[PDB]
């Protein structure tokens, strides 16, 4: 009529979470309604997407990084320091590489990232091919052979006391030429739009994602490890355009990564993420 | 539209799909799963006793710093269609003999806890026995979706109304419900990092 | 619409380890990532060993 329990003793380590940072498992949580089975639809007519939230959809999304003005005084085989602080060079890699300083002193840092860079700041290591859209803005007259060449590894740069930037002297047509360097010689007669696709190659499998974060004179290390190399534009010919029109043109370089992948979320940033909140007044602090 | 490629690299989805079994136990291809992982926003949130305190009064100085993903990623998008699991741990010096029975409720977003009849679904956990509180507030709004943060939200969604009986300090974490995603895609914000007084 | 539990009581001896010096068993440990299924490869080209 009523037996005993021919069972064993079930060990138990009181541990509520056993997973609160990982992305699958019985949550032991509670929903505030009758049925825990309140599961919604497959996003039909909910908003216009195929799939939005696919890194290939965001790292496959393009974003400008910096414009470069090329006047017909800039000399052959010398990069373009006009239009940005990066001399015309562009450290290839998903992590960010640009930052300025906002002051009262306080001297906080500020960035200018793209999605391809907006993600990696959320993780630790990375691996991905990149895709740079190079668009020249000009007429059918502004003509000139423009060379784009890759160089793997660290860069001749200037380790500023608070910020970081390049070195233009080490890039002349003699020091680091582009014959023994992957090359592309874009003509500007009529073929302008370009989309360079750089696979990922480096001695180490992945790469950090601090880039220029906490970078300055001394602590430039992770930066030198967080970028497989760099592209560097260098004119083959002085911009050929009559005074009838502008003696300078502009270049735009987008950015988006394909075949991307990442490893761990806890980023290597000295501190956590504190997105910049444009303050009340230009002087007001953060 | 000439687009070229360097390095004649082999199938990229041959090295990585191989070069994660050497380097990464996990093989991430989506991004939504981040919103299923609780990583904390606050670490003290010292509360007060017998004062039902809403959560919006907290998570307003939470989606302005990106200290989690559910905010850092917000900027990328504008909308959302799911519930926000809020897990609350305790750190209060409860070396005492009182009985803490931290209690949660349901309140529409952007209501101030004073104009409410506090009934309906709820939950009660005891930190002295279980220093967590792991509610799963669903999406009971009446609209297809919702802007991430506007000023016109006079009841377009549900929220918590966290209640307690003691003066407490809590740890917090929030990821999102099994059906919590975002809407459109947009660009990116500006980031600030380390600061150096002088 | 909602029944009771026609179950028994499950004994429980709170013992976290129940095996910390032996070489097989559910560890009750925690991995620090999304998926606990992060399992790596069979050591192909990882280093020169049979």
């Amino acid at each position: 009529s009523k037996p005993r329990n021919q069972n064993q003793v079930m060990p138990y380590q009181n541990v509520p979470g056993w997973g609160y940072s990982l992305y699958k498992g019985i949550d032991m949580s509670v929903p505030l309604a009758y049925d825990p089975n309140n599961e919604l639809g497959d996003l039909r007519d909910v908003f216009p997407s195929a799939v939005d939230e696919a890194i290939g959809y965001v790292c496959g999304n393009p974003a400008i990084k910096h414009v470069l003005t090329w006047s017909t005084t800039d000399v052959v085989q010398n990069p373009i320091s006009n239009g940005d602080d990066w001399g015309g060079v562009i450290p290839v890699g998903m992590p960010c590489y640009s930052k300025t300083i906002r002051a009262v002193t306080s001297k906080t840092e500020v960035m200018d990232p793209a999605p391809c860079e907006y993600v990696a700041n959320l993780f630790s290591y990375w691996r991905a091919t990149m895709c740079y859209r190079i668009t020249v803005v000009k007429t059918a007259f502004h003509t000139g052979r423009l060379e784009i060449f890759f160089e793997p590894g660290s860069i001749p740069t200037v380790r500023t006391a608070d910020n970081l930037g390049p070195d233009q002297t080490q890039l002349n047509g003699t020091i680091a030429p582009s014959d023994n360097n992957y090359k592309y010689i874009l003509d500007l007669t009529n073929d302008t739009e370009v989309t360079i696709k750089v696979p990922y190659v480096s001695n180490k499998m992945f790469m950090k994602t601090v880039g220029i974060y906490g970078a300055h004179d001394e602590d430039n290390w992770n930066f030198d490890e967080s970028f497989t190399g760099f592209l560097c534009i260098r004119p083959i010919t002085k911009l050929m355009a009559p005074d009838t029109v502008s003696q300078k043109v502009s270049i735009v370089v987008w950015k988006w990564a394909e075949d991307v992948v990442v490893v761990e979320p806890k980023p290597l940033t000295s501190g956590p993420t504190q997105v910049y909140n444009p303050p009340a007044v230009a002087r007001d602090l953060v | 539209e000439n687009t070229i490629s360097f390095f004649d690299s082999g199938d990229p989805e041959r090295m990585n799909n191989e070069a994660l079994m050497r380097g990464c136990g996990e093989q991430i291809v989506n991004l939504r799963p981040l919103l299923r992982t609780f990583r904390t926003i606050n670490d003290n949130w010292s509360l007060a006793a017998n004062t039902k305190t809403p959560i919006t009064d907290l998570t307003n100085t939470a989606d302005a710093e990106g200290r989690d993903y559910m905010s850092y990623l917000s900027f990328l998008y504008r909308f959302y269609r799911g519930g926000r699991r809020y897990k609350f741990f305790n750190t209060t010096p409860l070396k005492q003999s009182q009985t803490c029975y931290v209690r949660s409720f349901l309140i529409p977003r952007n209501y101030t806890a004073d104009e409410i009849n506090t009934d309906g679904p709820s939950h009660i956990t005891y930190p002295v026995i279980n220093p967590v509180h792991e509610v799963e507030v669903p999406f009971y709004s009446q609209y297809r979706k919702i802007p991430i943060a506007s000023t016109s939200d006079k009841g377009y969604d549900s929220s918590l109304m966290y209640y307690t009986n003691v003066g407490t300090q809590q740890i917090v974490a929030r990821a999102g419900n099994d059906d919590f995603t975002f809407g459109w895609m947009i660009g990116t914000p500006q980031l600030q990092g380390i600061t150096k007084e002088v | 619409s909602k029944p009771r539990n026609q179950n028994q009581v499950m004994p429980y001896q709170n013992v976290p380890g129940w095996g910390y010096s032996l070489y097989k068993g559910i560890d009750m440990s925690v991995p620090l990532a999304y998926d606990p299924n992060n399992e790596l490869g069979d050591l192909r080209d990882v280093f020169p060993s049979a």
């Binding site: - | 996990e26 989506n30 991004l31 299923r36 995603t181 | 399992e39």
Partner: peptide
């Protein structure tokens, strides 16, 4: 190969479920 079996079947987990 486990996660590499799900990533190839495109199971409903990776996409956030």
């Amino acid at each position: 190969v486990k996660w590499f079996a799900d990533i190839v079947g495109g199971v409903a987990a990776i996409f956030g479920w």
